[PDB]
Design a protein around this nucleic acid. Structure first.
Lengths: 554, 400
RNA sequence: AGAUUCCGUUUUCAGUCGGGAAAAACUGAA
């Protein structure tokens, strides 16, 4: 049933010409099978014989199917794709089940064979030719060319989606009550209707497709509440996702390795991190698609960690477009936060963890905000509006912090929830110098060549330390120096640098850091009682400064 | 009409920008806005085979009634051939800077008449997103000068000129500067008598800079001069020299000579008494080096001042401030820094359009992520300046 | 003397560090 829809005009990448590749002669058996097969696709109209003129060619493969005299033959389109007009994939991502509203009547029509039904542009078909040597040895070869969206071809999906939509459009202007969501060969048709009248609409629809060659098999959804639209079991109040099985065969074939990627990657928009990125490196050195090729501990171990995650299933409620969205975040530890977006107390949509630390020195107040903004858009994508928050931070703690911060910030539907681990600015610096605090003039330095330096200070009283240092930068000394003066001082202390670097880090009220010295410097800061860090122009004869200046010089 | 041929800049292809996620609402909004334009035939659906894309969004205008389609043409504009043959908005007034009152009009809707060069339409492709990605996006292609395009106005330059000429020669002294989709109509007439002229100008089409002021840097007014009070002053005047090479701290540093506790008070002697007062003078005397060079970009830097206040400086070359200022949006409840910073951004670019005739390129004191998730919520302009996110150092103090 | 800034992805995601003052990395998965 080759659809009558107009064909999307495909081009090759400018500067390139179609593929030309040799076919490794297959076994007598394999060949006799590919023919057997090709002959009916030729019959169905899917492909067609062509003369040995057509310069271009792409390889064919596929072994015994384990059931009588047939084979499963899938073609290597790598080249053709490498030279094909890259299209414009028109979607921000895959749809999340939680995004679906609750409908009364829902059916999932799996449009079958949908690719072979949708016709390929004439002027590009040339490029899709393939042959069939198989003839044991005195082999010449059979020669075909597709007439419809090929299986592996790069266009297929993007062209198929465009076709599918042009076709639904009509039936859609006609049935505004009905909601059709497509995602590959699956048509989620929902409508808040009387199971009777729905049945009827589904009939109608099912026939429209037919008038366009799109045949919808009877082996559909007709009863089961757990419809599998995109692997999301769609019960009437609970969508779920059956744990993804991930095998590990003997003959770990290349394409297998590729498709494997798919499953992982698909789940990934639910299942937190799985990217078999280092297995992907095995694909960074491609060869015959039929060849087997394993990898080290990289490969072996990656699958496992993925599995662990893949084991525990997931699920949530649908999106009542009349009940509020509520996000709730909790500081479940250092640099890792958790959050849940729900609508009904124990009936949440998406839960989530958010490990991050955007900076070398951040603050909990700061990270909370990051987590907020992540969640904000994340909703705007899925639900279409920004949720209301319940955050582990007191309204006054925020208010002080933004006022005490050089950058502009903002949280939306902020609302305090006294949870156990709470967020607070661990310390704060003094706005004005402490009266009666020993004033520490600090400075450090280091020779670029040797990468050694000293760090010390002088004071309004008389104390005067200095320290030898190995393998550091002048920043590291300027920090060491602040540290010292912090150690060798009391609960209240005025300290003074010839360095905006260290000043800055500290000014930002860093909760933690990648920098141990900074952490050290922080530990002290939380322990002291009043600190006032000031800054003076290096090299000016500023008192006390010129002094520590000389002390650290060699 | 016969379309004016425009072409991308040498060796650059059309834009290919991904669309940002839109709220189930702005989407709906767009969707209707487009279905109409489609009916009016100003746009037209296109396929997946047009590899190009510019993002769109729903701004929402003036006293806020409805919705507006906003295409972030910034890229297609960077890739569009400059306009200089068909001199885009001919000489910049320069009068504008001075008039008692400039008013901006949205001449933009005119553009929808003139047909766009066919071999260029592909480059305006835009895509309306779908929730949960339950639907392929709706894709379109302009068939007329689009709203935010650089090409538009210059092409329509002549039609406009013929249109205003009468009214311009009719009122020989009301400056009219066209910038993008706007019409900056400046005059010095009394407010009431100004408005009429606008209305006269308005029928035709239907067919307050003079108060702006710069920031004079000043040192504090003290007597309680502690050591760091002086250290402070010293540091600033040091940096201030980079701007005014005449300012010099030395007699001040001399007061500081020792290892004095920061809290120690210190006697401001004539050494310094001379220097402060003398310096105070020069902080108000023009940095003769200022020059607005039409070939250099304007850069704007904004610092957060905590009291719902912000400071900004527009400059082409560092330390050569073409202008400096301070927006203080007292938002007792409307305290969305993001909303503020935004309003800051919008108010600074209009100032520059009216003066240099260009929107500065901003260095925003905020995290991309943040700026990226809320900006649209407050944006009210027909346009969108370029922006770079940054981390402000001690300038907050250095000028507040 | 030292110290800033921006960029490298540009429909998104999966994997890490360096240069320059308009100037410069890929594959795979969606």
């Amino acid at each position: 049933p080759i659809s009558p829809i107009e064909t999307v005009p495909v081009k090759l990448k400018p500067g390139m010409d179609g593929p030309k590749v040799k076919q490794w002669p297959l076994t007598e058996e394999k060949i006799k099978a590919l023919v057997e097969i090709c002959t009916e696709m030729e019959k169905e109209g899917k492909i067609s014989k062509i003369g040995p003129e057509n310069p271009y060619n792409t390889p064919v493969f596929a072994i015994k199917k384990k059931d009588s005299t047939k084979w499963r033959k899938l073609v290597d389109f790598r080249e053709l794709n490498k030279r094909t007009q890259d299209f414009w994939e028109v979607q921000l991502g895959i749809p999340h089940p939680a995004g679906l509203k609750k409908k009364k009547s829902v059916t999932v029509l799996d449009v079958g064979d949908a690719y072979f039904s949708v016709p390929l542009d004439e002027d590009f078909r040339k490029y899709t030719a393939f042959t069939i040597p198989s003839i044991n040895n005195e082999t010449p070869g059979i020669r075909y060319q597709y007439n419809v969206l090929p299986q592996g071809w790069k266009g297929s999906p993007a062209i198929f989606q465009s076709s599918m939509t042009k076709i639904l459009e009509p039936f859609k202007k006609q049935n505004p009550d009905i909601v059709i969501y497509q995602y590959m060969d699956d048509l989620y048709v929902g409508s808040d209707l009387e199971i009777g009248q729905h049945r009827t609409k589904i009939e109608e629809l099912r026939q429209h497709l037919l008038r366009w060659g799109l045949t919808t098999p009877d082996k559909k959804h007709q009863k089961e509440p757990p419809f599998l639209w995109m692997g999301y079991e769609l019960h009437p109040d609970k969508w779920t996702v059956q744990p993804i099985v991930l095998p590990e065969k003997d003959s770990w074939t290349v394409n297998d390795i590729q498709k494997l990627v798919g499953k992982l990657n698909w789940a990934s928009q639910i299942y937190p991190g799985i990217k078999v990125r280092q297995l992907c490196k095995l694909l960074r050195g491609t060869k015959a698609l039929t060849e087997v090729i394993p990898l080290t501990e990289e490969a072996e171990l990656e699958l496992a960690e993925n599995r662990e995650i893949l084991k525990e299933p997931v699920h949530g409620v649908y999106y009542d477009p009349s009940k509020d969205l509520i996000a709730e975040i909790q500081k479940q530890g250092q640099g890792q936060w958790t959050y849940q977006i729900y609508q009904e107390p124990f009936k949440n949509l998406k839960t989530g963890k958010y490990a991050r630390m955007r900076g070398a020195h951040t603050n909990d107040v700061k990270q909370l905000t990051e987590a907020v903004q992540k969640i904000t858009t994340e909703s705007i994508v899925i639900w279409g509006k920004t949720p209301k928050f319940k955050l582990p931070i007191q309204k006054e703690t925020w208010e002080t912090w933004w006022t005490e911060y050089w950058q502009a910030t903002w949280i939306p539907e902020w609302e305090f929830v006294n949870t156990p681990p709470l967020v607070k600015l661990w310390y704060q610096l003094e706005k004005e110098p402490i009266v009666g605090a020993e004033t520490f003039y600090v400075d450090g330095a280091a020779n670029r060549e040797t990468k050694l330096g000293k760090a010390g200070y002088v004071t309004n009283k008389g104390r005067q330390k200095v320290v030898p240092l190995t393998n550091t930068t002048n920043q590291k000394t300027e920090l060491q120096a602040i540290y010292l003066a912090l150690q060798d001082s009391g609960l209240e202390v005025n300290i003074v640098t010839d360095s905006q670097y260290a000043l800055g880090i500290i000014q930002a009220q860093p909760d933690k850091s990648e920098s141990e010295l900074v952490n050290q410097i922080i530990e002290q800061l939380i322990k002291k009682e009043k600190v006032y860090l000031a800054w003076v122009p290096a090299h000016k004869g500023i008192g006390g400064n010129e002094q520590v200046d000389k002390l650290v010089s060699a | 009409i016969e379309t004016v041929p425009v072409k991308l800049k040498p060796g650059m292809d059309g834009p290919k920008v991904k669309q940002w996620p839109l709220t189930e609402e702005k989407i709906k909004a767009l969707v209707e806005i487009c279905t109409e334009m489609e009916k009016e035939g100003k746009i037209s659906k296109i396929g997946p085979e047009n590899p190009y894309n510019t993002p769109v969004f729903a701004i929402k205008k003036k006293d806020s009634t409805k919705w507006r389609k906003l295409v972030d043409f910034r890229e297609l504009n960077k890739r569009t051939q400059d306009f200089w043959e068909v001199q885009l908005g001919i000489p910049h007034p320069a009068g504008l800077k001075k008039k008692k009152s400039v008013t901006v009009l949205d001449v933009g809707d005119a553009y929808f008449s003139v047909p766009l060069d066919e071999d260029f339409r592909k480059y305006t492709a835009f895509t309306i997103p779908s929730i949960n990605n339950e639907t392929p996006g709706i894709r379109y292609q302009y068939n007329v000068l689009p709203q935010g395009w650089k090409g538009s106005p210059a092409i329509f330059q002549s039609s406009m000129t013929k249109i205003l000429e009468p009214f311009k020669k009719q009122n020989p002294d009301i400056v009219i500067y066209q910038y993008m989709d706007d019409l900056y109509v400046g005059s010095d007439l009394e407010i009431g008598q100004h408005r009429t002229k606008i209305e006269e100008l308005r029928q035709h089409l239907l067919r307050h800079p003079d108060k702006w002021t710069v920031q004079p840097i000043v040192l504090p007014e003290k007597d309680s001069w502690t050591v760091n009070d002086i250290q402070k002053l010293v540091g600033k005047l040091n940096w201030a020299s980079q701007i005014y090479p005449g300012i010099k701290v030395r007699q001040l540093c001399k007061l500081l000579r020792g290892t004095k506790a920061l809290t120690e008070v210190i006697p401001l002697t004539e050494e310094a008494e001379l220097e402060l007062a003398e310096n105070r003078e020069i902080l108000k005397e023009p940095v003769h080096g200022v020059y607005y060079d039409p070939s250099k970009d304007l850069i704007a830097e904004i610092q957060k001042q905590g009291q719902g206040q912000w400071t900004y400086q527009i400059y082409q070359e560092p330390f050569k401030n073409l202008k400096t200022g301070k927006y203080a949006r007292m938002r007792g409840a409307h305290t969305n820094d993001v909303k503020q910073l935004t309003e800051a951004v919008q108010k600074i670019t209009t100032e520059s359009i009216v003066i240099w005739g260009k929107t500065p390129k901003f260095k925003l004191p905020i995290q991309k992520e943040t700026w990226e998730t809320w900006w649209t919520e407050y944006w009210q302009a027909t346009w969108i300046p370029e922006w770079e996110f940054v981390n402000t150092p001690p300038l907050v103090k250095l000028w507040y």
